[PDB]
Design a protein around this ligand. Structure first.
Ligand SMILES: CCc1nc(N)nc(N)c1OCCCOc1cccc(CCC(=O)O)c1
Length: 156
């Protein structure tokens, strides 16, 4: 019904390589925290293990880890084998988790980072949103880090 997707991507659409993020953008962390606090957050195992240890699990949010390995220990998170039907939840990671949740989604919150990245094999790419989405495009912004970025919101 009402899954929300949130991701940060380069302008070429890359959301990371092996979960590693090439940009430092504290304004994106701030907006991620504002959007997801007090709600379940749904993620893959690689996103979970890539969280900074001090916020694994992400505090103030019910953390849910989706993986085909039924036996997996995530201290502080709920381990499920399939995407859960949590109405108010935010999907936060897994290029494949975004793909699976997109059908159930009526909101996407995107940070676009103006950073050139060389494509590498097995890159995680952002979902391409079709014409059913209504886009609200924020103004281009400059970070305390010097990077240009913008926030875009999509609804249907
Ligand atoms: C924030 C990157 C991001 N940015 C966007 N826009 N979407 C995402 N899915 C997304 O990855 C979420 C997985 C990594 O999470 C972190 C990682 C480090 C610090 C924090 C803030 C802690 C807090 O929030 O308390 C969160």
């Amino acid at each position: 019904m009402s899954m929300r997707l949130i991701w940060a991507q380069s302008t070429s659409g890359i959301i990371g390589r092996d979960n590693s993020i090439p940009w430092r953008l504290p304004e994106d962390l701030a907006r991620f925290k504002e959007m997801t606090m007090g709600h379940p957050v749904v993620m893959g195992r690689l996103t979970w293990e890539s969280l900074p240890a001090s916020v694994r699990p992400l505090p103030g949010r019910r953390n849910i880890v989706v993986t085909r390995d039924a036996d997996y220990r995530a201290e502080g998170a709920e381990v499920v084998t399939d995407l859960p039907d949590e109405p108010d939840a935010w999907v936060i990671g897994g290029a494949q988790i975004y793909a699976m949740a997109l059908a159930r989604a009526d909101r996407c919150e995107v940070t676009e980072v103006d950073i050139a990245l060389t494509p590498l094999d097995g890159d995680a790419r952002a979902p391409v949103l079709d014409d059913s989405w209504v886009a609200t495009t924020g103004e281009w912004q400059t970070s305390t880090s010097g990077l240009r970025f913008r926030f875009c919101s999509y609804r249907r």
